[PDB]
Amino acid sequence: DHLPIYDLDPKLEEFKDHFNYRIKRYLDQKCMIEKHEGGLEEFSKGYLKFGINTVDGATIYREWAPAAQEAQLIGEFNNWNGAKHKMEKDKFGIWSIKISHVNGKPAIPHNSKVKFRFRHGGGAWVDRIPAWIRYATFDASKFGAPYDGVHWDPPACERYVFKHPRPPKPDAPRIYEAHVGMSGEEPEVSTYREFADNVLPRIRANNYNTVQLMAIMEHSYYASFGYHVTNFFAVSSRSGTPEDLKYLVDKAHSLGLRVLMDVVHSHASNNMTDGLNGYDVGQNTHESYFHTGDRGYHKLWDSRLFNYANWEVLRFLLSNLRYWMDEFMFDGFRFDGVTSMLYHHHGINKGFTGNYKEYFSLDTDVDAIVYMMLANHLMHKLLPEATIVAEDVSGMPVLCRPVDEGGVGFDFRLAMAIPDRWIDYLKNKEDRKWPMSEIVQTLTNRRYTEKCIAYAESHDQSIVGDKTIAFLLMDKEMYTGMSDLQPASPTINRGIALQKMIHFITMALGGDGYLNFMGNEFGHPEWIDFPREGNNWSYDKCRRQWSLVDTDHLRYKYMNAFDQAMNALEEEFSFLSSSKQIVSDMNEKDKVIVFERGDLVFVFNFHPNKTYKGYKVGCDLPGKYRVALDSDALVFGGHGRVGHDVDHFTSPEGMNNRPNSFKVLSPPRTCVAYYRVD
Ligand SMILES: OC[C@H]1O[C@H](O[C@H]2[C@H](O)[C@@H](O)[C@@H](O[C@H]3[C@H](O)[C@@H](O)[C@@H](O[C@H]4[C@H](O)[C@@H](O)[C@@H](O[C@H]5[C@H](O)[C@@H](O)[C@@H](O[C@H]6[C@H](O)[C@@H](O)[C@@H](O[C@H]7[C@H](O)[C@@H](O)[C@@H](O[C@H]8[C@H](O)[C@@H](O)[C@@H](O[C@H]9[C@H](O)[C@@H](O)[C@@H](O[C@H]%10[C@H](O)[C@@H](O)[C@@H](O[C@H]%11[C@H](O)[C@@H](O)[C@@H](O[C@H]%12[C@H](O)[C@@H](O)[C@@H](O)O[C@@H]%12CO)O[C@@H]%11CO)O[C@@H]%10CO)O[C@@H]9CO)O[C@@H]8CO)O[C@@H]7CO)O[C@@H]6CO)O[C@@H]5CO)O[C@@H]4CO)O[C@@H]3CO)O[C@@H]2CO)[C@H](O)[C@@H](O)[C@@H]1O
Ligand SMILES: OC[C@H]1O[C@H](O[C@H]2[C@H](O)[C@@H](O)[C@@H](O[C@H]3[C@H](O)[C@@H](O)[C@@H](O[C@H]4[C@H](O)[C@@H](O)[C@@H](O)O[C@@H]4CO)O[C@@H]3CO)O[C@@H]2CO)[C@H](O)[C@@H](O)[C@@H]1O
Numbered sequence: 001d002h003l004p005i006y007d008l009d010p011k012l013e014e015f016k017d018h019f020n021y022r023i024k025r026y027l028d029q030k031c032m033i034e035k036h037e038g039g040l041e042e043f044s045k046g047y048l049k050f051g052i053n054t055v056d057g058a059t060i061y062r063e064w065a066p067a068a069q070e071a072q073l074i075g076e077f078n079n080w081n082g083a084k085h086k087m088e089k090d091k092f093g094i095w096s097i098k099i100s101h102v103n104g105k106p107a108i109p110h111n112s113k114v115k116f117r118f119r120h121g122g123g124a125w126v127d128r129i130p131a132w133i134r135y136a137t138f139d140a141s142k143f144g145a146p147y148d149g150v151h152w153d154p155p156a157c158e159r160y161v162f163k164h165p166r167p168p169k170p171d172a173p174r175i176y177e178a179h180v181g182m183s184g185e186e187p188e189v190s191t192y193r194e195f196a197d198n199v200l201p202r203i204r205a206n207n208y209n210t211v212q213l214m215a216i217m218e219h220s221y222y223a224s225f226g227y228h229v230t231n232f233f234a235v236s237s238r239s240g241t242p243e244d245l246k247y248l249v250d251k252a253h254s255l256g257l258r259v260l261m262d263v264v265h266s267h268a269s270n271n272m273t274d275g276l277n278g279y280d281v282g283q284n285t286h287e288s289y290f291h292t293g294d295r296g297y298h299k300l301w302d303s304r305l306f307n308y309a310n311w312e313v314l315r316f317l318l319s320n321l322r323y324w325m326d327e328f329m330f331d332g333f334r335f336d337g338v339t340s341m342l343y344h345h346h347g348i349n350k351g352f353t354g355n356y357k358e359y360f361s362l363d364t365d366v367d368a369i370v371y372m373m374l375a376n377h378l379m380h381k382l383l384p385e386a387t388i389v390a391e392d393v394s395g396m397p398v399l400c401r402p403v404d405e406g407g408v409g410f411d412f413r414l415a416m417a418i419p420d421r422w423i424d425y426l427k428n429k430e431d432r433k434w435p436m437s438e439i440v441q442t443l444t445n446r447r448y449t450e451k452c453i454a455y456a457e458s459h460d461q462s463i464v465g466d467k468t469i470a471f472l473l474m475d476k477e478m479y480t481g482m483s484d485l486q487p488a489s490p491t492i493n494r495g496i497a498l499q500k501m502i503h504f505i506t507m508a509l510g511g512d513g514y515l516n517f518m519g520n521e522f523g524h525p526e527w528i529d530f531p532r533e534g535n536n537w538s539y540d541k542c543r544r545q546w547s548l549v550d551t552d553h554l555r556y557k558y559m560n561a562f563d564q565a566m567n568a569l570e571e572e573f574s575f576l577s578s579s580k581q582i583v584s585d586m587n588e589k590d591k592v593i594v595f596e597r598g599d600l601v602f603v604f605n606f607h608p609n610k611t612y613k614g615y616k617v618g619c620d621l622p623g624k625y626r627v628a629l630d631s632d633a634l635v636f637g638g639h640g641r642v643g644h645d646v647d648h649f650t651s652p653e654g655m656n657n658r659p660n661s662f663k664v665l666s667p668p669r670t671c672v673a674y675y676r677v678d
Pocket of ligand 2: 036037065066067091092093094286287311312
């Protein structure tokens with residue numbers, strides 16, 4: 001009847017009807033799950049019943065295949081002959097078999113290959129990888145690099161034991177988005193252990209508190225960046241085994257880092273031999289993971305789309321969430337492609353002006369929203385400290401409100417509008433024509449009842465035609481002009497300064513959390529290019545040149561040190577988790593932005609050349625102000641013009657204006673945060 005979200009946003013009651021239906025569809029589905037499955041928590045334990053599971057004296061294999069008329073389990077254990085391992089179908093379309101132990105040992109050995117062999121209506125037999133397989137390996141020797149499902153039940157001598165607890169939820173997420181495969185300096189696919197031993201310390205040393213782990217779910221197409229999942233329960237085998245990933249998560253927890261995983265429940269790869277799409281043999285949507293016809297196909301991604309209303313699809317996805325959380329001790333997730341799930345048009349060729357009828361209509365996908373609400377309720381009841389992030393460009397209201405208020409249940413939203421604004425400024429505007437108004441409004445125009453994670457550039461700003469901000473600033477000059485033993489050219493000084501500036505203002509003004517993609521913290525040059533036919537499958541641009549930031553006589557160390565000190569500043573002052581956000585000056589003629597966040601006063605000089613001596617900045621309490629972070633510091637690649645022990649005494653006003661003010665030196669292209677001395 002009445003939802004609490006209506007009190008947060010009166011404009012929502014106009015669409016009560018919509019929400020009514022939506023909430024009804026939620027409460028019914030949950031109710032059904034509680035009546036016939038024992039509740040969401042038990043429903044999400046489906047990976048203990050489906051797939052291959054060892055019990056006392058036998059092994060149970062279950063697989064949902066309504067379209068099959070006959071089915072058997074084949075593998076190395078029966079030399080790919082399922083004659084003595086025929087499965088039986090029930091009224092729900094589920095095939096099952098119990099296989100007794102052989103000489104006291106399980107019938108299917110650990111680390112052996114298995115396949116689900118079934119005959120469909122036409123009369124032909126096909127072999128597929130089990131949908132709930134937990135490991136799948138490819139053989140690059142054979143043509144196709146075809147995958148094989150692998151039964152993963154390691155003995156205690158090689159099963160990883162988690163030794164460290166989950167860290168507490170931070171006051172604000174400082175997220176290091178990473179991809180294990182391209183995390184090494186060698187032009188190859190790196191391993192989970194190499195990432196845990198080499199990269200995680202870099203993340204902790206730069207004072208991040210969260211890692212966003214991409215490309216964990218298995219995907220046969222490496223260049224998909226993990227977005228085209230084939231085996232949803234399998235840890236991507238190109239970087240190691242599931243135990244290696246468990247070791248990665250445990251090591252991150254030992255360093256005090258929280259780990260989120262990329263969850264791709266928005267679509268599925270079209271790969272029929274290796275992936276889930278192989279269970280589509282033409283059956284109707286009520287016997288399939290996916291919709292049929294147009295609704296079952298994503299035109300932009302060339303992918304299959306789930307039928308979120310199906311009982312078995314709900315079991316599949318909710319159990320996938322519980323599987324990742326429980327078996328790998330993840331601290332939360334980022335749901336990718338949420339915009340495509342929210343609307344029947346998937347936002348493919350549609351811009352969202354903000355008109356509420358574009359959010360709440362019959363273009364709204366109620367099945368997917370019901371699934372996401374069930375998912376968020378389940379995940380927050382399993383782990384109240386979990387952080388669930390939604391990757392959504394539309395800005396759907398109440399998307400990040402709890403389920404019990406009428407919301408979708410996400411904790412944070414990705415603030416996906418800032419990067420393109422920065423790109424436009426860098427590409428088509430001269431430095432003296434940059435609008436401070438548009439920058440401030442882009443950083444601050446958001447729904448303040450819902451939390452958001454700001455970032456100047458993510459992984460997508462490194463791929464498919466996008467360059468890093470550092471490269472957009474300096475380009476080929478980075479190849480030759482980044483040595484610390486020679487004076488930096490004007491271009492290099494400009495680029496380093498503006499990179500620090502863009503990152504810092506996006507963090508301090510753009511939301512309630514920060515995200516940075518692996519390598520951009522030190523201005524990694526160029527772009528990311530995956531191995532493909534066009535480059536003869538080169539890994540040259542599918543890696544991270546840690547050499548550049550580690551070398552003392554180069555200048556990347558400056559951007560890295562500024563990133564580290566900026567994260568440490570956020571840790572000490574907690575300005576990302578403070579609602580006090582006052583922009584007290586926006587000098588468009590002088591290109592200066594003065595604002596207040598937390599207990600800090602931020603002065604940004606975006607002017608190309610002019611220094612402002614004795615610039616007056618507003619502040620609340622009178623007293624003694626000093627530099628907390630200054631981008632012109634020599635250790636950050638500046639010229640050291642500001643000076644850190646200088647006392648900025650306040651003077652009351654009258655001898656956006658504030659009670660008191662103090663005067664600062666503001667060199668061009670600089671950012672200084674000031675704190676009040678106790
Ligand atoms: O303590 C004590 C100590 O001791 C010791 O030490 C010592 C020692 O011993 C001694 O020796 C000394 O040292 C010293 C020395 O001597 C000196 O020399 C120095 O050195 C230094 C330096 O200085 C610095 O700088 C550094 O360096 C570095 C750097 O930094 C970095 O960077 C690196 O580099 C590198 C890189 O990385 C790489 O890469 C390479 O590069 C290369 C490349 O590759 C190639 O290619 C080339 O390039 C080139 C080209 O070719 C051409 O062409 C050009 O280009 C251009 C073009 O033409 C134009 O056109 C433009 O382009 C553009 C376009 O237009 C657009 O389109 C875009 O693009 C695009 C692209 O194309 C693509 O990629 C896209 O995408 C794609 C996708 O992905 C797919 O999928 C498909 O779709 O396709 C697509 C495509 O279509 O993307 C994009 C878009 O987004 O854009 C573009 C661009 O913008 O433009 C361009 C430009 O750029 O040109 C180029 C260039 O020129 O070549 C290159 C080369 O150059 O390699 C490099 C190198 O070189 O690394 C480096 C090295 O490291 O460092 C150094 C060293 O350090 O100093 C020193 C000192 O400091 O002394 C010492 C002390 O004592 C012991 O040892 C120690 O330990 C101890 O401690
Ligand atoms: O009704 C109360 C029951 O609630 C729960 O049952 C679930 C099943 O577990 C789900 O599997 C599903 O059943 C679907 C099934 O997924 C789907 O394939 C379809 O079955 C086909 C079958 O494959 C085909 O071979 C043919 O012969 O029969 C059906 C024709 O389409 O439809 C089934 C019904 O939806 O959903 C139900 C709930 O709706 C719970 O698990 C049970 O314990 C409980 O009895």
